[PDB]
Design a protein around this ligand. Structure first.
Ligand SMILES: Nc1nc2[nH]cnc2c(=O)[nH]1
Ligand SMILES: Nc1nc2[nH]cnc2c(=O)[nH]1
Ligand SMILES: Nc1nc2[nH]cnc2c(=O)[nH]1
Ligand SMILES: Nc1nc2[nH]cnc2c(=O)[nH]1
Lengths: 295, 295, 295, 298
């Protein structure tokens, strides 16, 4: 046998960092879950039980804290690159680092129409993630995204003209409920090193806000008959507003709402134009994926 | 042996309702999970295997759907009362109905700084619930609540002066993080019947908004060395602002954030006054409860 | 206002203990999640923010570990009584201690047809729990239970004879799938103190086994048209076999499996006597409860 | 801009099938969750909102049910093949079918020392899965695995001799607790088509049982200084017991049990040789992976 591939590291490392302003007295908090996986000349740890090439995962957890203490944790795209570079630079035998970061929401509270200096609320289970691959000699690869974004539109969505055969029973519709969770991922053009990443810092937070805004707006305004076409319009706008992006990827898990026919009960009308009460379905669910690039 | 208590019904009944305004064309959606358990002279289903006294759980389901279609599903406190009343009025042997409703958040999307007519977002995992108890010849008991409200304050929270013995290792503190999930419940005075509940409708949504605002404010502004003291303050205000309320119950699971001593590494200062990076703890967690009533 | 009720303590405290047999060298492991809530003269901590009467929840945690170290953690009924007793006896202003324990399975591995001395496998997600209420001058109250026991019988289950009205659409059946999670609890007669509990120790593990065996046996053998009737028989046998038990309580959340009509496709027969493929339903579900006592 | 990649289908389709032996009266049940994703000339559905090329997800669901009714659902490897094949063979514009199947346990109950004819128990949250990729003109690729296998050994596990530096605080140990959730996947050699998969049907259940056995036994008996070394040995044996296997992948999440120092309480000894009470840690956790293949050395 032979080791064709190997990674290892620490997962689920929860980190919280606070920023205090001595002047204004305002405080800002950052909470995220980090995962670091290493690659390199560690083959013997598997084949010869040689631990000498092993940087303890516990030490990888230590490095994460230490790094967050000496560096800025925002934007996550930067912090990830810093954390990733450290490993391939500090350890001669390590040649790849894979960093995953999940950012939780801690939105500043508004008390009496005013932003509180030190109170926060988790206003959503929506996440801002980044997957940064740092490979020796090959620069830095970044993949930004947002997930856990749940949306619904009560009308202005249709579905007809689809293939029909001996396996179809679905009835075409010109009005229906469209609900889904949004997983959007934008891949940045390869970066040569930390210095290049550092120089584009301003673009990160901006592009994210751009991705979020485009998604919501397009979703809300688009009177579709093809979820596929809807997400394609979403990817176009993103690619157009940010030149540094190489590809945009969407993954929309459809959430179905069934009509309930109650006519059997005193001629109760609750279908088609009279549909008012629906039964949300936990499963199954449609899944539509999409990767869009430049011509 | 003998049956001392029995209940049965349908759980996890997902429901969705949409209200359309022909005039403006603005739509509104409601989604919730309903549970209905029944009580009465049904012992024989257990003892003699007699089903004749059993109202099918599938029919309880049908009923929930029908009820929603024929009535207003908001406020929940009202809808719950109607649904519970239905069973004791339609069945001779049914003497009590216990309805549990969980309302999910579908916040209206703001596009271009203007509310969208038919697009929604799940802006939180926070819920608004109700527990209605309809008992023949004893009125309707209603318990309202809000849960899943997660907050954190980076300062202005202390803890000192607590009991100290041979089992204590916790050091006193005058500045720490305070994070928790909020579970607040207010119990209304017993209503005589559907009519009376219908007469106080406007107080349900208002009392809920009030309970929410007081919790958020008190938490944010109170600088106490006692989570206990803070929650009592919240209950006080709620009881003072709504006379129709008998008791207010709070249950706060204290989520801890530990200081990370990094001194062992090049004398890095990250404790006490220099504490910037913390480690969130998934478990365990303090749990503080409290039921406040009137003198 | 006035404090009607108050509790507080530590929750989700994970504990693991290993017992090494000094003769054979065989190791047995125990793992469980503990929760401890205290009651007593602590009102002032809420009304006057007086922390002097507060035993830190951190100390509560510490006490759990220490107690586990100096005492046997099995059976959980004993360990819960020891832990509960400690708090009311060590603190004068503490009058009640509510201990909840969840036991996780760590089944010994059989390797090559022989029990391994120190390797375990988490076979089920089924738990064994205990709730122990230790109240000063009122003895020790113990509620044992098993939960998370999932079973299914493809046949020998019926449902017909139930009530039928204008809300009924369900067809009666004489063959159907019965699946459900099992939640069984057995209340022990009130115990005077730790001394009494200790003397009845051998009865705890035994009865749990009995409850589990009866539940499984009855469910599999009973050919009934009433779940309610099946659970009652379960309760009966448990009360007959153990006199120290006062009441048995079952809570069965049904899991439905619908037939799938496939006649629209080449007249495929998949209903009634030809039903082979079914569609498991996540929700909603029927919930049947029952508390049985002695005449 | 342009469409680089595109898939779509039905996810989380729960299925239950029962087999009744009219002779013996013994019934056997099967439950699984299926996911089917399709690929092909469907770019227009994105670029020009053309649903004409779209096979409704609802119809994909119906198809799973029909296929389940007309064919065996065991072993999963076979069923996934039968299902993926159907799509590329029935739709000219559909070129690839990605089928994911999760198998839920329903173990027959033993009552009074004998197996019950129609009663089962969910004796574990452990699962048996398969990922089948049917591509037009490329054959059938199969990835079988087992997951959710949680194990723990209270001793006979060590960790010393690792790299130490200014970021290191961990102390060396010669006796510790080793617990982990096992995730094992074995890739089969490419199959030309359905007929070839059918011929090998018997190897599927046999290899699954071998992988599970090898995993448990090795975990139990190995006294290794590294989880890496222990998972390598497991892969070795599996590759050695089945020649149709090309690679074996292992993903082990080391769950930690920390010692608790109680000496601050009357000098109570609870560390090292005296350790009895441990604190299980929910997070974070170590994560070790590795893909083992066949050597080129003769
Ligand atoms: N087995 C094992 N234990 C560890 N503990 C900390 N790091 C490691 C590692 O790489 N392997
Ligand atoms: N066994 C059983 N099946 C049901 N199906 C619908 N309602 C019921 C009920 O009360 N018991
Ligand atoms: N606020 C608060 N913090 C604690 N930390 C430890 N115990 C307690 C308690 O009772 N209240
Ligand atoms: N939008 C949309 N709705 C569907 N409903 C069933 N299949 C589909 C699909 O592919 N797209």
């Amino acid at each position: 046998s032979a080791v064709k591939a190997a990674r290892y590291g620490k997962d689920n490392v929860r980190v919280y960092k606070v920023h205090k302003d001595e002047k204004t007295g305002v405080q800002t908090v950052y909470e995220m879950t980090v995962c670091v996986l290493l690659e390199g000349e560690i083959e013997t740890s598997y084949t010869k039980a040689d631990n000498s090439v092993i940087v303890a995962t516990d030490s990888i957890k230590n490095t994460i804290y230490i790094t967050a203490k000496q560096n800025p944790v925002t934007p996550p795209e930067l912090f990830g690159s810093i954390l990733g570079t450290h490993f391939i630079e500090k350890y001669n035998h390590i040649h790849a680092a894979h960093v995953n970061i999940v950012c939780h929401r801690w939105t500043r509270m508004d008390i009496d129409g005013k932003p509180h200096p030190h109170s926060f609320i988790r206003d959503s289970e929506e996440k801002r993630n980044v997957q940064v691959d740092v490979v020796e000699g090959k620069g830095i690869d970044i993949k930004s995204s947002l997930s856990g974004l749940t949306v619904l539109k009560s009308t202005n969505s249709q579905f007809w003209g689809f293939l029909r055969d001996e396996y179809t029973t679905l009835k075409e519709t010109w009005d229906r409920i469209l609900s889904t969770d949004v997983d959007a991922t934008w891949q940045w053009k390869n970066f040569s090193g930390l210095q290049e990443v550092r120089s584009h810092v301003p673009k990160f937070d901006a592009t994210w806000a751009t991705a979020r805004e485009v998604t919501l707006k397009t979703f809300a305004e688009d009177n579709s008959a093809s979820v596929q076409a809807t997400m394609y319009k979403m990817a176009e706008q993103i690619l157009a507003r940010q030149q540094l992006i190489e590809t945009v990827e969407y993954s929309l898990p459809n959430k179905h709402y069934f009509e309930i026919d109650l006519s059997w009960h005193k001629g109760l009308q609750n279908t088609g134009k009279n549909a008012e009460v629906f039964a949300p379905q936990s499963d199954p669910n449609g899944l539509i994926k999409c990767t869009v690039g430049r011509s």
